[PDB]
Coordinates of N, CA and C and ligand atoms in Angstrom, one line a residue:
Chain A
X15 N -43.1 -178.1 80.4 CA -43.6 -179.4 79.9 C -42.8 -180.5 80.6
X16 N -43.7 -181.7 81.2 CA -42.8 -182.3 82.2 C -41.8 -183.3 81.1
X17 N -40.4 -183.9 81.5 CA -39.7 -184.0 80.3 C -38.7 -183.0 80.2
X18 N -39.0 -182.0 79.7 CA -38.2 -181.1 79.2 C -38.5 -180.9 77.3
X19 N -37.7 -180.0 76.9 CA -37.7 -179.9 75.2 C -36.9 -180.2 74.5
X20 N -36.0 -180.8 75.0 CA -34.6 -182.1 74.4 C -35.7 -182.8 73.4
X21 N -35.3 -183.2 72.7 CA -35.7 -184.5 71.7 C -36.4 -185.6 72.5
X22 N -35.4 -186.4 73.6 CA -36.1 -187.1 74.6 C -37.3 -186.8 75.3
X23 N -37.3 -185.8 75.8 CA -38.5 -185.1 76.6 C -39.9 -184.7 75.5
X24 N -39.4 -184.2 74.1 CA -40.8 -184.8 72.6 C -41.0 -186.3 72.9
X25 N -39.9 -187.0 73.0 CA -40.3 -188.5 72.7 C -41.2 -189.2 74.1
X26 N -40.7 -188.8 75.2 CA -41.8 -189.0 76.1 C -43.0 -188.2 76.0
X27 N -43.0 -187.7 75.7 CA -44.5 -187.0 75.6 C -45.1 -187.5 74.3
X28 N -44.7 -188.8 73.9 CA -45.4 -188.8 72.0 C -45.5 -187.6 71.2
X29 N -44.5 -187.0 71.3 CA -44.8 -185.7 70.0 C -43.7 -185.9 69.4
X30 N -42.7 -186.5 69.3 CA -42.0 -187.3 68.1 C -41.8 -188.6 68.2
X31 N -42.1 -189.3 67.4 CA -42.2 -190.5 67.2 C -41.2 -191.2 67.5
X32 N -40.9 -193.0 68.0 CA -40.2 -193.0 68.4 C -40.2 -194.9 68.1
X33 N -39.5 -195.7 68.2 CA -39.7 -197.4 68.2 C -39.8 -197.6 70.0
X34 N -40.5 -197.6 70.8 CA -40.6 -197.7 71.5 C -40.8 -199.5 72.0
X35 N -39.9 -199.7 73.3 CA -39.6 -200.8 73.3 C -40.6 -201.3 75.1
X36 N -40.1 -200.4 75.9 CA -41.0 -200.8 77.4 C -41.0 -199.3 77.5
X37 N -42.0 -199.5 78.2 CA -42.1 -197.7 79.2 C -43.2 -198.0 80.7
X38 N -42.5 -197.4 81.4 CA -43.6 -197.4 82.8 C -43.1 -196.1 83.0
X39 N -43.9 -195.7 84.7 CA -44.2 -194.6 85.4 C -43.2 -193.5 84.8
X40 N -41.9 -194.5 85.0 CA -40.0 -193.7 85.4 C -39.1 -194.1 84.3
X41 N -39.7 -194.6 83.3 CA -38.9 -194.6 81.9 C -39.4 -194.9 81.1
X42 N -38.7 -195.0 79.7 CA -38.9 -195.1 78.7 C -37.6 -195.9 77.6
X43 N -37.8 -197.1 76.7 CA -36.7 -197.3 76.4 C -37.1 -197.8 75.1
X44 N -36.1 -197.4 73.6 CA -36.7 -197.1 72.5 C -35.5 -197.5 71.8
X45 N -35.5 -197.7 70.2 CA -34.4 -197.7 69.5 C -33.5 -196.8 68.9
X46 N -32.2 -196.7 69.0 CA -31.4 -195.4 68.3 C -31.9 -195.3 67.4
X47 N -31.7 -194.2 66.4 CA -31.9 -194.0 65.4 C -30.7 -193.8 64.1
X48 N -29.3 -194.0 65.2 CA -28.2 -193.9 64.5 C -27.2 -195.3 65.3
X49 N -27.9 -196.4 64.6 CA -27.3 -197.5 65.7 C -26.0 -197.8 65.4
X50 N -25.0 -197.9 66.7 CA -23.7 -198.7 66.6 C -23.6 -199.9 66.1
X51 N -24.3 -200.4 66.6 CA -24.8 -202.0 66.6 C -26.1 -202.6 66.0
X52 N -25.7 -203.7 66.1 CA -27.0 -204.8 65.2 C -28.1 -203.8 66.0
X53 N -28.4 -204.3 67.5 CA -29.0 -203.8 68.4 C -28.6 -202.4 69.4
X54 N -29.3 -201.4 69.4 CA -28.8 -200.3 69.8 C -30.1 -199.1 70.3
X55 N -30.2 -199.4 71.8 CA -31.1 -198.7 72.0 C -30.6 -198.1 73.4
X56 N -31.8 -196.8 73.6 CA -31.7 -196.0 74.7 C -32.8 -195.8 76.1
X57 N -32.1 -195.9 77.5 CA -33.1 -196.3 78.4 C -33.2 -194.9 78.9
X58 N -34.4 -193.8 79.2 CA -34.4 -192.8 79.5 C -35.7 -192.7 80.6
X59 N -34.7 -191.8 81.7 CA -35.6 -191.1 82.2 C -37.0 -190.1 82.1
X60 N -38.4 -190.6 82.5 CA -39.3 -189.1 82.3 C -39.0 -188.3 83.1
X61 N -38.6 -188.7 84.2 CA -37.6 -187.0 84.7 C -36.8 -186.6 84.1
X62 N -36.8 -185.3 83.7 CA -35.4 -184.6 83.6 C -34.6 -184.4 84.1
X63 N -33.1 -185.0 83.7 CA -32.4 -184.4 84.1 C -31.2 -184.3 83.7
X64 N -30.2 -183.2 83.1 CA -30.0 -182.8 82.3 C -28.5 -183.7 81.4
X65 N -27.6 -184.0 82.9 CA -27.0 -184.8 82.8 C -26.6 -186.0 84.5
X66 N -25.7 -186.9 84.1 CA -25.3 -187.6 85.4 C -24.4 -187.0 86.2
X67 N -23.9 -185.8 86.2 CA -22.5 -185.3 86.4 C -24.0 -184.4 87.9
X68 N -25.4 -183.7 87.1 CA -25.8 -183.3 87.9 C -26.8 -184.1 88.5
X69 N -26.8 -185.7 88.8 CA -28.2 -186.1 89.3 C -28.0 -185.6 90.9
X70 N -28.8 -186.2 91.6 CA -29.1 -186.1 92.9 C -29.1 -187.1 93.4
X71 N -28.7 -187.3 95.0 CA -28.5 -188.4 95.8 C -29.8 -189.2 95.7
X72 N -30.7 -188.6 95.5 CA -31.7 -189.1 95.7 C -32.2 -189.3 94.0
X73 N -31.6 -189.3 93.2 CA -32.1 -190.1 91.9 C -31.7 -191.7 91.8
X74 N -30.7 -192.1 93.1 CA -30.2 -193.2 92.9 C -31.0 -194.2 92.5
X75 N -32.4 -194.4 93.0 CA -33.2 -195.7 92.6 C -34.0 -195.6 91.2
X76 N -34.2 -194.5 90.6 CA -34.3 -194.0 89.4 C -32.9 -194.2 88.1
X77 N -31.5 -193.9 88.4 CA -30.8 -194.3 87.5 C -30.6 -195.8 88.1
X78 N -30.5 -196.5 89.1 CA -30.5 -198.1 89.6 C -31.6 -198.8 88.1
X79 N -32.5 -197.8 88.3 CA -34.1 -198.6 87.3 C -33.7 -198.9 86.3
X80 N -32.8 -198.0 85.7 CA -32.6 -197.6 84.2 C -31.9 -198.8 83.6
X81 N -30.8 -199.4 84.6 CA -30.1 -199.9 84.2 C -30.7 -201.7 84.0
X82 N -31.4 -201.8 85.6 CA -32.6 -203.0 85.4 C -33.4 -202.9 84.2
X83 N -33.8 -201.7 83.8 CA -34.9 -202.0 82.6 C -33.8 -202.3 81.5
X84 N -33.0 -201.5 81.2 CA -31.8 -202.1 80.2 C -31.4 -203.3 80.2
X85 N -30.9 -204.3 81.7 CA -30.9 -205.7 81.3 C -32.3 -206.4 80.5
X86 N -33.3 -205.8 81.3 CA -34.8 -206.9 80.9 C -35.2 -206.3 79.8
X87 N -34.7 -205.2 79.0 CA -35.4 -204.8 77.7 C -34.0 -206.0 76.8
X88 N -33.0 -205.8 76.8 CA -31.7 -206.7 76.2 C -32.1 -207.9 76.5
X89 N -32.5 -208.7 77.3 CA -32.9 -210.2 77.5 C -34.2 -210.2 76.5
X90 N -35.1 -209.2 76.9 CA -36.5 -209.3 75.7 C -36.1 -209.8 74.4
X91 N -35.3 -208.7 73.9 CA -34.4 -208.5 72.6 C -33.6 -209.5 72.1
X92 N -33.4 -210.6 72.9 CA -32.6 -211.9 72.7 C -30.9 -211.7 72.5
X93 N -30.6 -210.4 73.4 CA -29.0 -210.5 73.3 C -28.3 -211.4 74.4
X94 N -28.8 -213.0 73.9 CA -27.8 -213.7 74.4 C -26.5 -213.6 74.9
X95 N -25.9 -213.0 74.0 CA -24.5 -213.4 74.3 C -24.0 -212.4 74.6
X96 N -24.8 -211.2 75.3 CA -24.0 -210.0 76.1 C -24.4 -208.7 75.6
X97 N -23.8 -207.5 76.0 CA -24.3 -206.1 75.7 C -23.4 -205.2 76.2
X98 N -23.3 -204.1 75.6 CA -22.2 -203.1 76.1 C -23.7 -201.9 77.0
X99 N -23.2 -201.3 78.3 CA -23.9 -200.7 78.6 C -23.5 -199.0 78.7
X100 N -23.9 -198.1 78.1 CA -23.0 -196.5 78.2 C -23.8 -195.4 78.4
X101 N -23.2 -194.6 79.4 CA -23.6 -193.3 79.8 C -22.6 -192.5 79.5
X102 N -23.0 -191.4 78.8 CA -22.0 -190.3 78.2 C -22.4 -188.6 79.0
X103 N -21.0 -188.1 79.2 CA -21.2 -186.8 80.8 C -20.2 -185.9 79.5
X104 N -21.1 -184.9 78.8 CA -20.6 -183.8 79.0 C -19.7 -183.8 77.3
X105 N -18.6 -182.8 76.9 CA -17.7 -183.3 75.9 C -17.1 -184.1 75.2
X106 N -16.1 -184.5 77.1 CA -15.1 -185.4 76.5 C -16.0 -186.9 76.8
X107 N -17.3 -187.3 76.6 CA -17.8 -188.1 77.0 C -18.8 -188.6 75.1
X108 N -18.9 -187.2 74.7 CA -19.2 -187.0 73.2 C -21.3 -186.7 73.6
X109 N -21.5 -186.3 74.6 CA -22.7 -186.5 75.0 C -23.5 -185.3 73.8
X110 N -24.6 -185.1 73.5 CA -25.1 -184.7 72.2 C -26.7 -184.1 73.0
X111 N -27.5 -184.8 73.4 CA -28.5 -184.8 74.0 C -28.5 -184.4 75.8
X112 N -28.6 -183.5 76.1 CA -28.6 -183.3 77.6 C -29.7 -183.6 78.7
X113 N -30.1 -184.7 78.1 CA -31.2 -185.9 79.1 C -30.9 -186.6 79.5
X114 N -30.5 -187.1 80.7 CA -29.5 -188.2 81.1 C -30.2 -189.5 81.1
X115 N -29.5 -190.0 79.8 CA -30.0 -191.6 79.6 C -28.7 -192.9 78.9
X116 N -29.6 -193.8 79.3 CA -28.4 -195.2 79.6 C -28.3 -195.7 77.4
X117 N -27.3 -196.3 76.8 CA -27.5 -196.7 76.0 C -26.9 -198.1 76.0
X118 N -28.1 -199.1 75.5 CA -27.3 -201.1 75.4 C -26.7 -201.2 74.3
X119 N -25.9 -201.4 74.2 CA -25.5 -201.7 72.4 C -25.0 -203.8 72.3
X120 N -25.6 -204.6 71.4 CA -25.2 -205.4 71.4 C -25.5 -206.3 70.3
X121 N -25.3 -207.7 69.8 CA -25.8 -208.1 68.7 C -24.6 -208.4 67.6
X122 N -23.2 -208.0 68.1 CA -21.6 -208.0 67.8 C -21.0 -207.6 68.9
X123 N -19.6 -208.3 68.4 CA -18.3 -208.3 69.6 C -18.3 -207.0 69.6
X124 N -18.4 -206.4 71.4 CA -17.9 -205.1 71.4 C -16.7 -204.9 72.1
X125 N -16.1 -204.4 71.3 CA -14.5 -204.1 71.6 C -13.3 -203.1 72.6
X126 N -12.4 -203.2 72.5 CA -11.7 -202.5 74.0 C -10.5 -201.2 73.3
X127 N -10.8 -200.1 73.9 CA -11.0 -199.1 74.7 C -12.3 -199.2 73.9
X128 N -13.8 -198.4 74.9 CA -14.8 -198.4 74.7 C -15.0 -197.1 74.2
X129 N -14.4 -196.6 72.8 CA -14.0 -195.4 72.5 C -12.9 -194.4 72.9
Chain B
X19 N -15.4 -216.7 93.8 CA -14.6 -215.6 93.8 C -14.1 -215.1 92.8
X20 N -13.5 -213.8 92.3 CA -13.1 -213.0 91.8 C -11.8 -212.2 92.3
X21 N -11.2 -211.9 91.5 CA -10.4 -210.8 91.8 C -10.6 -209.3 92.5
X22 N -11.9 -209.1 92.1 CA -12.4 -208.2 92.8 C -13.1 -208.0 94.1
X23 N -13.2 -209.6 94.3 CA -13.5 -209.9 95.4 C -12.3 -209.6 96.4
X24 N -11.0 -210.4 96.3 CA -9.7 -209.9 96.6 C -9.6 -208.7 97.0
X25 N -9.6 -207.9 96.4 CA -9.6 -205.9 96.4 C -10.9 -205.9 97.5
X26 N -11.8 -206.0 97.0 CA -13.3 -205.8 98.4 C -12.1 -206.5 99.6
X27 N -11.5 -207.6 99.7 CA -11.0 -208.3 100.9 C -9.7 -207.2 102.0
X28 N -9.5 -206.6 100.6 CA -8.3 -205.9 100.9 C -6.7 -206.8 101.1
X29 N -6.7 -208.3 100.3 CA -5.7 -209.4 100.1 C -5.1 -208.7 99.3
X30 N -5.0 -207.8 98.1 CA -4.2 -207.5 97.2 C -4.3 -205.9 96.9
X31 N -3.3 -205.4 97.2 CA -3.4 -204.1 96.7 C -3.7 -203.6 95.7
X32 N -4.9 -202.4 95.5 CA -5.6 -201.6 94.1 C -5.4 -200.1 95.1
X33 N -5.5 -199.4 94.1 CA -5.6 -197.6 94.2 C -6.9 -197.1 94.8
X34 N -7.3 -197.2 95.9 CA -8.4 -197.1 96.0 C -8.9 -195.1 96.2
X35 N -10.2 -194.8 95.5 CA -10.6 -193.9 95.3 C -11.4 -193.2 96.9
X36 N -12.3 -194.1 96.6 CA -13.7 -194.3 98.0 C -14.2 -195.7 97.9
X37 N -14.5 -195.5 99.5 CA -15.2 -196.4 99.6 C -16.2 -196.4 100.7
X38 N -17.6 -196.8 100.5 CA -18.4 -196.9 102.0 C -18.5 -198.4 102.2
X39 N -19.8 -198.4 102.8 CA -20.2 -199.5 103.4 C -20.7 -200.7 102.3
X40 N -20.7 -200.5 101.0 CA -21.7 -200.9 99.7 C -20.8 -201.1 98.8
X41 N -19.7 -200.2 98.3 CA -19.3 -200.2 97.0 C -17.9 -199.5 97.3
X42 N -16.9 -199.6 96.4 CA -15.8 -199.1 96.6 C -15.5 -199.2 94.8
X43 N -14.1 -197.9 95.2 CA -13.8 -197.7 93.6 C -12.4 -197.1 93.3
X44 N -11.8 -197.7 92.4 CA -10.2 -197.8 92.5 C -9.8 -197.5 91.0
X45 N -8.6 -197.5 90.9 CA -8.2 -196.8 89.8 C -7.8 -198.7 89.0
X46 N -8.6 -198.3 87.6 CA -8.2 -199.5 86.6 C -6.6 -200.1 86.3
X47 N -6.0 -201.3 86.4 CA -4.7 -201.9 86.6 C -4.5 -201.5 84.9
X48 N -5.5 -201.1 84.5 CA -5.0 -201.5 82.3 C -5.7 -200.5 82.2
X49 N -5.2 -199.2 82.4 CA -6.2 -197.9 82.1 C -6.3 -197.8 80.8
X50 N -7.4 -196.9 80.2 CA -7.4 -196.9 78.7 C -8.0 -195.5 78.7
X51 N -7.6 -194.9 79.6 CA -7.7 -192.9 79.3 C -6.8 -192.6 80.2
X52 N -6.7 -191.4 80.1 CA -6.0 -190.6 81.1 C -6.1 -190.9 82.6
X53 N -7.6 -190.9 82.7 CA -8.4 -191.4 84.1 C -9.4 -192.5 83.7
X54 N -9.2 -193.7 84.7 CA -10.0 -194.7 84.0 C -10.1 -195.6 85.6
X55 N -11.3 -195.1 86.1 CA -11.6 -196.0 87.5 C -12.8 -197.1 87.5
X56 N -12.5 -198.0 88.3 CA -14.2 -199.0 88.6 C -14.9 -198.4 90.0
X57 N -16.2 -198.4 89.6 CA -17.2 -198.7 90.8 C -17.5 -200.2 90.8
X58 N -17.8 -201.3 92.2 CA -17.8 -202.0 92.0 C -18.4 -202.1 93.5
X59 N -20.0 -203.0 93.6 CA -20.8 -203.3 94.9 C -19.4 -204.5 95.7
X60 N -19.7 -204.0 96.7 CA -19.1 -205.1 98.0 C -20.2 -206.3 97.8
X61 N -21.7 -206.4 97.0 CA -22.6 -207.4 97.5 C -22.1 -208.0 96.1
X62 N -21.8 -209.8 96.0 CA -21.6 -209.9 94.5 C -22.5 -210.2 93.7
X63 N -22.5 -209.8 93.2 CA -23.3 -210.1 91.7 C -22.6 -210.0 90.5
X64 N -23.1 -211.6 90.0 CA -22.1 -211.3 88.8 C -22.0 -210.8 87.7
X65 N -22.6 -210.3 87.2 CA -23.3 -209.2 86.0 C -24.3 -208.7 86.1
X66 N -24.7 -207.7 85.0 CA -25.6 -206.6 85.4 C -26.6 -207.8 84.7
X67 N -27.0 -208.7 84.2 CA -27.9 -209.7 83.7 C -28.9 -210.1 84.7
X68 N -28.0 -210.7 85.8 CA -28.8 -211.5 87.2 C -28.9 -210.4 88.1
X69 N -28.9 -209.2 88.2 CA -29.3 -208.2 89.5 C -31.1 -208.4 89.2
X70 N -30.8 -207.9 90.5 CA -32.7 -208.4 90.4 C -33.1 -206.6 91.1
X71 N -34.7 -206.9 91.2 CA -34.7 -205.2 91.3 C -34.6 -204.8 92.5
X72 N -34.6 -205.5 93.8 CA -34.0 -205.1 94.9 C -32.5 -204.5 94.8
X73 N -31.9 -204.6 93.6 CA -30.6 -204.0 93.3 C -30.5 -202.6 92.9
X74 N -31.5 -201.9 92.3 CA -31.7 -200.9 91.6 C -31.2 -199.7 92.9
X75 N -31.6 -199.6 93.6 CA -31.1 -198.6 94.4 C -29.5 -198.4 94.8
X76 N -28.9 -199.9 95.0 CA -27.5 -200.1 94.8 C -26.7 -199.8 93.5
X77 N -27.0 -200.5 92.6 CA -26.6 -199.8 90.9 C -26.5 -198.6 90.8
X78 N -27.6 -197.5 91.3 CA -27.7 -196.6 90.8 C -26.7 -195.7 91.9
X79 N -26.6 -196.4 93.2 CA -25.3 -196.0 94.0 C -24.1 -195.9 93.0
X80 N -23.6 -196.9 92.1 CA -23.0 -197.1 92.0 C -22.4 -195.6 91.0
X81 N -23.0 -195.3 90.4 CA -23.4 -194.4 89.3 C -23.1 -193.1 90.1
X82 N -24.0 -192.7 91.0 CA -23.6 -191.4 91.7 C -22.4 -191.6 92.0
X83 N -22.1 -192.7 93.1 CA -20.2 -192.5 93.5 C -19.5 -192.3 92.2
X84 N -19.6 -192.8 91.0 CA -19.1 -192.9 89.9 C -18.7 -191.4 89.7
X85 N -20.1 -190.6 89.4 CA -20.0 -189.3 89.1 C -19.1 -188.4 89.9
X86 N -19.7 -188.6 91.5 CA -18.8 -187.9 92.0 C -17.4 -188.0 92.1
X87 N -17.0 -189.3 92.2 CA -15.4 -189.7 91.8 C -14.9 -188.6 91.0
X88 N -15.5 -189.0 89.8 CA -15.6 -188.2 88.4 C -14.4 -186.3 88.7
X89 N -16.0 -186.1 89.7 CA -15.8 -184.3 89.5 C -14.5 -184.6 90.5
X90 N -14.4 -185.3 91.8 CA -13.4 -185.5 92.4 C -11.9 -185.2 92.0
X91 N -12.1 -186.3 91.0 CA -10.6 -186.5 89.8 C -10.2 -185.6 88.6
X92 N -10.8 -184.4 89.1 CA -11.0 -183.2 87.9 C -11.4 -183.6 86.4
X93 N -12.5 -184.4 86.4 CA -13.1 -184.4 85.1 C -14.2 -183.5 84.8
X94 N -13.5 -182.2 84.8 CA -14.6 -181.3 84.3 C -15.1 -181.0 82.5
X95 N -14.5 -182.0 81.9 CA -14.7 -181.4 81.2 C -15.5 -183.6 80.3
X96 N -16.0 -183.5 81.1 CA -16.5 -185.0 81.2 C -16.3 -186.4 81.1
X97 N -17.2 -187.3 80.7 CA -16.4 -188.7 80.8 C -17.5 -189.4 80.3
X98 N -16.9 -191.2 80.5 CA -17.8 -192.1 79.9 C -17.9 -193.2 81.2
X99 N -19.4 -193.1 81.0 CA -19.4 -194.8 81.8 C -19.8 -195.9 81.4
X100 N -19.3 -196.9 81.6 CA -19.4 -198.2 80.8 C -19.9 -199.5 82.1
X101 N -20.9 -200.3 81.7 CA -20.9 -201.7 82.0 C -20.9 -202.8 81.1
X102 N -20.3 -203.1 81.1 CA -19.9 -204.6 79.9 C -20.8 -205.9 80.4
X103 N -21.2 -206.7 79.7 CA -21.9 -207.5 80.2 C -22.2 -209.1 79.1
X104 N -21.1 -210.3 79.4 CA -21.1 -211.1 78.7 C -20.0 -211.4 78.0
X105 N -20.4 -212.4 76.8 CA -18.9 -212.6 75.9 C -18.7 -211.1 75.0
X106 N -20.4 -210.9 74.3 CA -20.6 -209.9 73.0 C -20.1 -208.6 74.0
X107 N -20.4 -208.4 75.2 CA -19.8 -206.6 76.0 C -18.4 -206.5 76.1
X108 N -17.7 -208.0 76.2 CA -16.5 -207.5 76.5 C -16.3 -207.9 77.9
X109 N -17.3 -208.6 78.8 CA -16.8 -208.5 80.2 C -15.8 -209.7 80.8
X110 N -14.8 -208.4 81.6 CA -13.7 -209.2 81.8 C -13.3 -210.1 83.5
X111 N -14.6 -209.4 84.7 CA -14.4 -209.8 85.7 C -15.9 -210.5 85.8
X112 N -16.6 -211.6 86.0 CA -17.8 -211.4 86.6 C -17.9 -210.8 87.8
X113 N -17.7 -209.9 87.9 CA -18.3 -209.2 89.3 C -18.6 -207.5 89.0
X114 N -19.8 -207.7 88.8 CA -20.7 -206.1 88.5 C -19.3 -205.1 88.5
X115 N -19.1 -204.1 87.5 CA -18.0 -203.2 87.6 C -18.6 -202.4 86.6
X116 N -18.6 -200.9 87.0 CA -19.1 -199.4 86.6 C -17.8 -199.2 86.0
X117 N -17.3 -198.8 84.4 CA -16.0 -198.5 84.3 C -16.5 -196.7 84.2
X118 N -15.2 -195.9 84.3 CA -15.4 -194.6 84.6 C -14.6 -194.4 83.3
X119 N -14.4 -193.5 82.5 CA -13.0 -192.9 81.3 C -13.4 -191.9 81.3
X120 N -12.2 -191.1 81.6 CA -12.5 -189.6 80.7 C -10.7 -188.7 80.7
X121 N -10.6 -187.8 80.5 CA -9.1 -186.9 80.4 C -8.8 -187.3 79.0
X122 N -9.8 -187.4 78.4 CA -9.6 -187.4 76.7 C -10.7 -187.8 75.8
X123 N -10.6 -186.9 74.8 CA -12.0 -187.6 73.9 C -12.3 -188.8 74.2
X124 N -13.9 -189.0 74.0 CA -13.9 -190.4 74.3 C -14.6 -190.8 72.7
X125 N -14.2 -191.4 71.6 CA -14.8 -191.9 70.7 C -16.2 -192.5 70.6
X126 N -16.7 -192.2 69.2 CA -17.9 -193.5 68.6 C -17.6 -193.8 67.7
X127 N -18.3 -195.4 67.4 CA -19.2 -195.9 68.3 C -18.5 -196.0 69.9
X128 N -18.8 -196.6 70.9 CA -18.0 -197.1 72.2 C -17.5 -198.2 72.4
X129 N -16.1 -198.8 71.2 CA -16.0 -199.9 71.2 C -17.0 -200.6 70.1
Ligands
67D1 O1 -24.6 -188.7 70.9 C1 -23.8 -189.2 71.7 C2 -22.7 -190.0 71.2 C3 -22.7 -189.8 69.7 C4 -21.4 -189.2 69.1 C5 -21.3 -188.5 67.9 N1 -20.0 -188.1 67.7 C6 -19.2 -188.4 68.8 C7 -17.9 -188.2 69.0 C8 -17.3 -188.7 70.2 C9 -18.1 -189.4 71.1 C10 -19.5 -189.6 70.9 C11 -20.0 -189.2 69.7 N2 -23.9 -189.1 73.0 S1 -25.4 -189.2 73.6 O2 -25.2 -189.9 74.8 O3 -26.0 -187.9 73.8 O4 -26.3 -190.1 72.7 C12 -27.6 -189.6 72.2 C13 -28.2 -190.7 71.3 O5 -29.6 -190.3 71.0 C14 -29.8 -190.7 69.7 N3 -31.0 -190.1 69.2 C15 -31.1 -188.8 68.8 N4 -32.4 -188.5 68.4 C16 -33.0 -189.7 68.5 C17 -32.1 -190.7 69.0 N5 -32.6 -192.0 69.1 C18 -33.9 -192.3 68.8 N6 -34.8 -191.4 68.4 C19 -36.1 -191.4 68.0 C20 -36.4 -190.1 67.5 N7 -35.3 -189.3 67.7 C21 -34.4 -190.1 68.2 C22 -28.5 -190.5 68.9 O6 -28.4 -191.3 67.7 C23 -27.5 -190.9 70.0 O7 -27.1 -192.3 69.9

């Protein structure tokens, strides 16, 4: 099933429900469900792929997207005053979901070390 | 200009990791892990806010070199990447910067 069967890969295919915020051809971008922040949402690839540690040279204009759709979904969203942007690889990264996707967090001061 | 601009000039010495023709990437002056490097475009832009989408293929450069740095600098056992963006992110250079962390748990939330 294109996607994959991660949770993300249900959520693009609408078979689990989701706050969905923009979506075109090559993503999709929705709200956590366990937010850090005021505002806290995730920008995901409909390709799969599993993590960033394995993309391909040639995913570059696909994760480039992700990150464009992440500013213009956060400007939609009215986070004036800035946004934290995070991709998590693996353990020591705390990654949970092995779909490789971008997370905005914003809407309060976000603070230093970034975890 | 920027400080980072400086480092792209090669006026002030940074640790540099790699670099091509686009983007270069050096080890953070105020690390906050074990391993803690920037990717950062030679073209400036000053945050990820104003890239426009003729950038997306560069950004997402930035991301792969990030990674591969990553496996480079023996983070096998993974890491965090961060772009800050504004007063509310924390951003401390305007000039687009990929931060890399890993060689230790990385906490949540992320900051
Ligand atoms: O999960 C982490 C760090 C956390 C974390 C927990 N403990 C830690 C310890 C150290 C570092 C990070 C952590 N790393 S992660 O990059 O894979 O993020 C996946 C994200 O996906 C979210 N999520 C999961 N199911 C859903 C969802 N969002 C929206 N939905 C709608 C329907 N269903 C969902 C989830 O809440 C999380 O924010």
């Amino acid at each position: 099933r294109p996607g994959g069967d991660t949770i993300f890969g249900k959520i693009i295919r609408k078979e689990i429900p989701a706050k969905i915020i923009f979506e075109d051809d090559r993503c999709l971008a929705f709200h956590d469900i366990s937010p850090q922040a005021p505002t806290h949402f995730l920008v995901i690839p409909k390709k799969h792929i599993s993590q960033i540690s394995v993309a391909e040279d040639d995913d570059e204009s696909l994760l480039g997207h992700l990150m464009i759709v992440g500013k213009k979904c956060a400007a939609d969203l009215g986070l004036n005053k800035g946004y934290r942007m995070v991709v998590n690889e693996g353990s020591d990264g705390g990654q949970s979901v092995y779909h490789v996707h971008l997370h905005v967090l914003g809407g309060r001061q976000m603070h230093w070390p970034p975890g």
